Design a binder for this molecule. Structure first.
Ligand SMILES: [Mn+2]
Ligand SMILES: [Mn+2]
Lengths: 183, 188
């Protein structure tokens, strides 16, 4: 298999109103575990399509998996997916999601972090993403960023422990994610 | 010791025909790899620029962003967004080496081409924007010897597509775009 071949996606929220945003679309690459976070106003098809058009400008996935939230089961979303050539796969009573709990724990953690920062979470979201993808996974044996961008690639970060963060609210965020993500 | 995400070039193109609520595209180019991000927006405003760049900087914080002195980029709101993130903002001036040179010509060529492709599909360019970006980043550069995608994600890393010639695109609406891009990109 390959990166960008399959995505798992879900909405978290409603979150505390931060700069007018109430939800985050969480999209995870199935192979590398690389996570993209897209803040939105609603868990809607429109916002889902907006976000995924940005993501799928990089590569078009073979498959996307989600639960049956309204955003994902609409005929509009279905038509978007059909046109792009993307097969949609839903969590069904007869379909097998580990494969569910992994996502559940990370989304729980995600929600805790964002709700725990009521008015700043929107501005910190980019730091959350960055921190998650540059955190070592015991399952992977590398970080998701290493797996997407190349293990021995020269990274954008001068300091792999701080990730070139300097602000205290950001550094404590990185500390909290590093110690909670897979434990 | 140059690396991806060291330096961004950014600019707006537009106004374009209003496709699904959008009138502009923020064009961001990584200086090392030549990898291009395209973000559709309703306006060439600070708030649109911040919103778009917040998505991009979820991947990495650039050290320098180079733009013209457009109102969106010289506002104090945008200065504070950048200062808070340790991003150095650099502006085109009449005595700046990168404007009126090889860097400017290459950037202006790209943006002329982008504009042409989008204005040519007044109602549907928004739907096709992701195909434009894909095709740009997965076309070979004689200058580089590689594609921008190879340069950003790794030369030996897995190609997103499966068919090199078509990039897995099946609709002729998309294959038309790919042909234009392949023909025109580095033959300006
Ligand atoms: Mn859900
Ligand atoms: Mn401009």
């Amino acid at each position: 298999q390959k990166p960008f071949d399959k995505f798992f996606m879900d909405y978290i929220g409603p979150l505390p109103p931060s700069q007018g945003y109430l939800y985050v679309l969480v999209v995870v690459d199935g192979m590398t575990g690389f996570t993209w976070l897209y803040p939105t106003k609603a868990p809607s098809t429109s916002a889902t399509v907006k976000s995924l058009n940005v993501l799928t400008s990089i590569a078009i996935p073979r498959v996307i998996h989600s639960d049956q939230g309204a955003a994902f089961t609409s005929s509009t979303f279905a038509e978007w997916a059909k046109e792009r050539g993307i097969h949609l796969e839903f969590s069904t009573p007869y379909h097998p999601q580990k494969v569910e709990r992994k996502n559940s724990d990370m989304k729980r953690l995600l929600t805790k972090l964002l709700v725990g920062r009521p008015t700043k979470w929107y501005d910190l979201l980019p730091v959350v993403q960055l921190a998650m993808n540059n955190t070592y996974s015991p399952v992977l044996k590398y970080t998701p960023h290493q797996l997407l961008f190349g293990i021995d690639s020269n990274t954008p970060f001068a300091n792999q422990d701080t990730l070139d963060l300097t602000r205290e609210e950001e550094l404590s965020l990185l500390q909290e994610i590093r110690t909670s993500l897979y434990h």
